[PDB]
Amino acid sequence: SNAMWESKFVKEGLTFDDVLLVPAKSDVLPREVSVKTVLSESLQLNIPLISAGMDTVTEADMAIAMARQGGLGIIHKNMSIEQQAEQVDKVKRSGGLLVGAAVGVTADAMTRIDALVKASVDAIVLDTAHGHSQGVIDKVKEVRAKYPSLNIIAGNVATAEATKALIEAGANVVKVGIGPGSICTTRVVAGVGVPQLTAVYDCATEARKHGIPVIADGGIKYSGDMVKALAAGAHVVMLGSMFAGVAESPGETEIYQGRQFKVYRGMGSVGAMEKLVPEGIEGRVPYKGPLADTVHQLVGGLRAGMGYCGAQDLEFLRENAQFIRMSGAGLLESHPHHVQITKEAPNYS
Amino acid sequence: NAMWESKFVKEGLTFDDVLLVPAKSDVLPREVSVKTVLSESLQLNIPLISAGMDTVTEADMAIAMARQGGLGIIHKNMSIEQQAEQVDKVKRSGGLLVGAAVGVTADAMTRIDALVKASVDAIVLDTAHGHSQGVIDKVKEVRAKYPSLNIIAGNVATAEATKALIEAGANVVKVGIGPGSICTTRVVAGVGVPQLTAVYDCATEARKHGIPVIADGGIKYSGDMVKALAAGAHVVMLGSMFAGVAESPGETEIYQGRQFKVYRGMGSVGAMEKGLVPEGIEGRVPYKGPLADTVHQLVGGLRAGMGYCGAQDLEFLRENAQFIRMSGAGLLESHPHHVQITKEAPNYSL
Amino acid sequence: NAMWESKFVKEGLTFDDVLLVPAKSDVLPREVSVKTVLSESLQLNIPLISAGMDTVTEADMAIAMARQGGLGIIHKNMSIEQQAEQVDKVKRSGGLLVGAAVGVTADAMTRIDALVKASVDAIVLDTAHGHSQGVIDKVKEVRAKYPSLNIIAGNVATAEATKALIEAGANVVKVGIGPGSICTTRVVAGVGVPQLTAVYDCATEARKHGIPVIADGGIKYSGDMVKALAAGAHVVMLGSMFAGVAESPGETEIYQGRQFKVYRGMGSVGAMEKKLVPEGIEGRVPYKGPLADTVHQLVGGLRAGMGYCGAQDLEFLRENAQFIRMSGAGLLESHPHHVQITKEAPNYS
């Protein structure tokens, strides 16, 4: 059989910068469009935004701010079990807010999850580099066996088979993203990945049959990228780069060449794991001030995009929005071009 | 839901994706007719309209545009009395054609009343999303009150949106969602259609009704205008190539050692405040001098383009011009390459 | 609505979109014949013709081109008696082949007569749009007066334009609408055809009548010439790669301590002055020294390319060479990449 040999270069993939959402007939204005989403009966968000579970993006201060904006924060796992549990307890104490927590597939995974459940965590995130492995499938089933009502967010994946395997394993939400992270080099050092917009659409196609929402994680650089991800099947997007520069994110502000910056590094980089083979890099990000100003520009772009597509809710955007593919020349026409920009826009660069 | 499996079926082309195919020509570029008829009371000698923006078109720009055979749309970022006076100023300047921009607001009727009493030739019901029930209901209200007033409705980018505004009374449909040089709509909202596909798709629906379409935004060089008109557009609307003109509002300022003019989107922070999630940027463009020199280069490129395609009038070019798709390597071959340019060209900058 | 539905059906390819597929070879590059025959009265030892531009070819350039085995086209930006003097000087220098470019004007016949009296080998009815009735009628007008004169009519880029000029009496058709390095026709008028497709489409029609086509413009490296010949062209025309040559008109101008020479398009403002809507730009090119060194690299790169394709002569390459289409990433792989070039090569600048 040579079926696998002749199908190597058949599939095509698309990313955010390859398409545009086609405007449709609209009766609702951006001001009166609903942006709420339901990941599960216990996890309902006012805005479809989740801060990434990374050591440079989300701790308690970011999770508290995210939940108060209507979103969700994922406490990273690069800390002790008692430390992460103390932050989850700190968030839910500060007004009864939603909070998540990252958990790696390891031997101490169950012990870490036990402390988080005692801290009344709302969703554990079994985050790993390859969600389509048997070790993750087995560990997702163990958490469902011990905690039948616990929200399990499993990732990351990029194929329909992987999403189908995790849904059977007990995952309530499937996080899609293999490569697109702004600080990610997995596609470069390992050669493996799927274009994110095609990855979200392929995984959502399988997950919508079982009523399982998916999380588009990584690759979102502008507000429009989020609208393209949600319109491709995602119930919610996870952001890392666009949340690293906010004031509430962990770490202090640094001065470089006079301007204020913040440290943003991938969890697979050398510094974050402290002879290792990294799949991420360490970098800096401009300080953008408080989170409220960044969230406002994100939801504002979503409300504008939903107003164009005639979507009064994120379900109509998920079921009716149509894309149109474009070339590189179409992308340059989409951005500003042939004009010397004088000052900064709050929602562009 | 068949919509799910068809999400990524469509393809869209822009100006830099295609080239006009040269055909047999019995007419010289000097002998072609660039005239265009948009309605029974609106006929332009050149297919050029200056955008209704606070850095592009006012009284001085509209007067100059009409003297060249074009049309000028006075922007709406001013009081109703100030916009009506500039419309009257253009009309008393030799009987020139003039337009005015009106937003789809509750005071739109009050603004239109002053413009029609100022003998405005056309009103542009300009908004971000033309395919909304608010625009459809507004153009019908203007149609009922003024059955003979020319109504330009936009912006749209689909055939269904063009059908909605035509059947709602609009005489001309303006096409362009996201192509503007100062526009970030496709970036912040992720919504748009590649302009040449948008013009062609909208022109296909409007051609059934005998309705002209305006190609608005995305035109960086004079050749892009020839592609837009060949894709089905009766007339193009320019903003970037008109802001560096002396007749445009604002004064000259020295930047990068050269003379520059302020050019900003009407959806940017500065324009929305002087007349918050924006959909445009604030920038500047090189100073190009009087409008006469710029218009001559634009029309000259169109006359050359129509001469290559063998089109005597704009109808032949609209109905017979053929394109050919090219890659990015074709775009770099189309521009100058591997030669360090020493002097400016009047139709090619940098 | 057939014409309305077929507007965006055609697709064109240029040099940087393809590569020549290497084939079985029994001949070495040095043993390969590169001679070409454009007519019984015009055979060239090398498949190279210098462009008829005021900054590329005059008397001294045509002599050096002919003694290398090529051909020079004396441009038309000079008096009628001055051009006949230049054509005479080339024939006075050993009976060499020489051409002259004339425009489609009322004095075209008056200019051609003075050049035929000078025993010109080929007249070149150069034109921005060769598919015009004025060009077609003037080809019949010149052919009826000179049945034995070689007429190079252009420029065209479609098969229907090639056929229109052939039956008009033109025995050689020059192909190129837009690809010139100094050309802005595709930018100011929006009209053009990718040069590789334009040559292929014109060669397909011209080969039915045994008419050779000239690949004019768009050739920046020696490999682009091999692709143009492999597309069906008998000979290529160069302007940029011959402008920096000492034999080209004008003396050397210095810029940042380096030797340069002015290279401008015949449709640029400066060339036509010797209110105007130009289709070309004015620029400079690095001084490359004598023509013999540039031709050696060009013909040398052809011998290798013909060796890779197993072509003994230019007829086998025109009839058997295969291309393979590549993406922009293929072009980046084709050039040197991820290495800091320290020395400039004689054929790669």
Place this chain on the structure above:
Amino acid sequence: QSNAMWESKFVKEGLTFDDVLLVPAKSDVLPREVSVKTVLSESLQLNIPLISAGMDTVTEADMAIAMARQGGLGIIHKNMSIEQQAEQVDKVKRSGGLLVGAAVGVTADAMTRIDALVKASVDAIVLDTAHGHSQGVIDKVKEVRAKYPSLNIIAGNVATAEATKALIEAGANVVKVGIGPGSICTTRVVAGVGVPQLTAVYDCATEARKHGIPVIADGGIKYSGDMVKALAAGAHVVMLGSMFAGVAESPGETEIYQGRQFKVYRGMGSVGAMEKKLVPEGIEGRVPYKGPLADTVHQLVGGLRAGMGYCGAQDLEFLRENAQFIRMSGAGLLESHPHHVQITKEAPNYS
């Protein structure tokens, strides 16, 4: 008729590394468990699928020794006399009985050079040639096969399936693939000839698999992932030049420029390599200094173990037979690299 070749001129399409991505599949193995061993022949088995290029700025005695101790193979370049190369191969074989190869051109002194290398206990000779689909190369492969029936013969370079079949029938045990993809190469620019390397590897492996012949993916590998893509395209082993030139074991000394250390890396077809008139098919340049070879090899093998772990491949045969790609645009390439973040520190596998 005769218009068959005329109408099929622009039909083929080619893919390179930056055109595709490996599609992750279900995996039961961890990257530390995967087997990276490969068998070009029973007398030439490499523990890692890495071969250093036979160039005067990449591989000599010190590099070939270091490559073999990591489980790879070094190809001694041919820009030296017969006694020098025979002694260079002898120096590697004396240094613990390590595997070593040597480059031999298709010339009159070819048999004289090969006889000195076979006596030096060489394990594989490489008929390195700009165009491997020539009759002189085909004749010279048969000539070596007739005299040394058990000698490993590596022939190249080719980029089509019919060329691969011609080299196999001539007697070559391994076929090198790569016409144009080299980082220092200008063949595709000066001669316009070539095939995108990932498509060339796939087409040549398709023909070579029918004869049970391994294929070497030569050239174009810029990062660790490009090797994984080349092996997943059907190649048994990859050959690297740019990613090995800046290694401390490479020939030549280091030079400091603006604080950073560099090392000269030039193509064999360049002027400088042929000098010690000419129409070159390569350029001369410099690459960053990467220190000892062990640090570069560790990242290469580490990235390969990660890719196979993503693809669910325990061995390299599973990756050759089962790995599926997905094609992407230039906008997919920018998403694959880091983006919109100012890199502050240099990663050991990404610069």
